[PDB]
């Protein structure tokens, strides 16, 4: 097989209907697509993309055009890994633990129970934020943990990690943006990859 | 002078001419052959649907 992580680009680069995505096949024509600019959720590359959806279902995600980030390219993950939210496992309503079973609950009841439990847990609470949250979402998690739960036990690292990693991120990463850019990678005479598989 | 009464001669006359109303619904009137009635999806003589789902319509 073709077998490359960038195969979808060949679909987007073909000036005719020769190469086509089997996922998008016969599912829509341009006029009925709702198309919106987007950013890929998966990697830290932050590719600009164009999400196309019909009748409320995302059909494809084209590479967009961000010369400073990804130019006109994606990996297959960003192009096609958008069906996760519609595989049937999505939680559609707030849930509560009643009788040991997870039962659908109203927003009011769920919020009330969660607030009661958190207050009963006062300072003895941890906040695992995960790496999927947006900058705003992660900020909300941190602000909730420190202002509401009055705890510093906040960590987005849902993966192998170390305290040395936290110290390094604070020292050299946090609060320092645009120190290196894609445009600089293309021009760097030497690039040393440590613990990184690009 | 009778010209001002011409309208009377009209209506009375029409009172003796056959009404021109179409007999719908019992006897529906003839629509134009080209009339834009309900859309219809057609088949080939062997029964296959003609619609290829091109969405051009
Ligand atoms: S068949 Fe498809 S690729 Fe060929 S001209 Fe028509 S739209 Fe373009
Ligand atoms: S498109 Fe591929 S490389 Fe770009 S952010 Fe998504 S997963 Fe990462
Ligand atoms: S325009 Fe295309 S999709 Fe619409 S009825 Fe005709 S063949 Fe079918």
TrEMBL record, chain A:
Residue sites binding [4Fe-4S] cluster 3 per the record: 40, 43, 47, 75
Signal peptide stretch: none
Residues annotated as binding [4Fe-4S] cluster 2 are 14
Which residues bind GTP per the record? Answer: 132
Q: Where is the 4Fe-4S Mo/W bis-MGD-type domain?
A: 33-89
Function comment: NDH-1 shuttles electrons from NADH, via FMN and iron-sulfur (Fe-S) centers, to quinones in the respiratory chain. Couples the redox reaction to proton translocation (for every two electrons transferred, four hydrogen ions are translocated across the cytoplasmic membrane), and thus conserves the redox energy in a proton gradient. NDH-1 shuttles electrons from NADH, via FMN and iron-sulfur (Fe-S) centers, to quinones in the respiratory chain. The immediate electron acceptor for the enzyme in this species is believed to be menaquinone. Couples the redox reaction to proton translocation (for every two electrons transferred, four hydrogen ions are translocated across the cytoplasmic membrane), and thus conserves the redox energy in a proton gradient.
Describe the family membership recorded for this protein in Swiss-Prot or TrEMBL.
Belongs to the complex I 75 kDa subunit family.
Its recorded name reads NADH-quinone oxidoreductase
Which species?
Mycolicibacterium smegmatis (strain ATCC 700084 / mc(2)155) (Mycobacterium smegmatis)
Placed within the complete protein, the shown segment runs: 200 to 397 of 794
């Amino acid at each position: 097989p073709f077998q490359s992580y960038f195969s979808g680009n060949t679909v987007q680069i073909c000036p005719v209907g020769a190469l086509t995505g089997t996922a998008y096949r016969f599912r829509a024509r341009p006029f009925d697509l709702v198309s919106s600019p987007s950013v890929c959720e998966h990697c830290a590359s932050g590719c600009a993309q164009r999400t196309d959806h019909r009748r409320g279902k995302v059909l494809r995600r084209l590479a967009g055009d961000e010369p400073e980030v990804n130019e006109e390219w994606n990996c297959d993950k960003g192009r096609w890994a958008f069906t996760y939210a519609t595989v049937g496992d999505r939680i559609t309503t707030p849930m509560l633990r009643d009788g040991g079973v997870l039962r659908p609950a109203s927003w009011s009841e769920a919020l009330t129970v969660a607030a009661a439990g958190l207050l009963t847990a006062a300072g003895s609470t941890g906040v695992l934020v995960g790496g999927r949250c947006t900058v705003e979402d992660a900020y909300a998690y941190a602000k909730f943990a420190r202002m509401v739960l009055n705890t510093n036990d906040v960590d987005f690292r849902a993966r192998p990690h170390s305290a040395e990693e936290a110290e390094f991120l604070a020292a050299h990463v946090a609060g320092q943006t645009m120190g290196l850019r894609y445009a600089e990678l293309e021009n760097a005479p030497t690039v040393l990859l440590a613990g990184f598989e690009p | 002078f009778l010209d001002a009464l011409a309208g009377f001669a009209v209506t009375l006359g029409s009172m003796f001419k056959k009404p021109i109303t179409e007999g719908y619904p019992e006897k529906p009137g003839p629509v134009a052959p080209r009339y834009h009635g309900r859309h219809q999806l057609n088949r080939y003589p062997d029964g296959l649907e003609k619609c290829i789902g091109c969405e051009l319509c």
